[PDB]
Amino acid sequence: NVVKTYDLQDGSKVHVFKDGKMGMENKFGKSMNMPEGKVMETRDGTKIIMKGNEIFRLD
Amino acid sequence: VVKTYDLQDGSKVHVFKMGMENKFGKSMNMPEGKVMETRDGTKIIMKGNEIFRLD
Ligand SMILES: [Cu+2]
Ligand SMILES: [Cu+2]
Ligand SMILES: [Cu+]
């Protein structure tokens, strides 16, 4: 049910699900609370930020 | 002006430096951390003087 996963530099992951929803886990894979309005760097060199329960990606 | 986002509320975002313009053409600061909808049916938000676009 995961359509996409952002692999973040600090070891955490954000899963985007088929249902529209979004989940985050730390480097150990335990669930995290998702920050809002906080820029997060991916391992493939992009930046994302979460807001209003949506993901925005650097332009 | 290198890039222009046309917004729903009638205003514009320019990247030249970055700034906004109301419907009347009056320039204004670029609102940080605030989501905005483009006439082309996408959403943007700016942070630390960078534009992020709905993924
Ligand atoms: Cu997982
Ligand atoms: Cu202009
Ligand atoms: Cu999130």
UniProtKB/Swiss-Prot annotation, chain A:
Subcellular location: Periplasm
Keywords annotated in UniProt: Copper, Metal-binding, Periplasm, Plasmid, Signal
Expression induction or repression: By Cu(2+). Maximally expressed 30 minutes after induction with 0.4 mM copper.
Superkingdom of origin organism: Bacteria
Function according to Swiss-Prot or TrEMBL: Involved in resistance to copper. Can bind up to 2 copper ions. Has higher affinity for Cu(+) than for Cu(2+).
UniProt name for this protein: Copper resistance protein K
GO CC aspect terms: periplasmic space
GO MF: metal ion binding
Binding partners and assembly: Monomer in the copper-bound form. Homodimer as apoprotein. Dissociates into monomers upon copper binding.
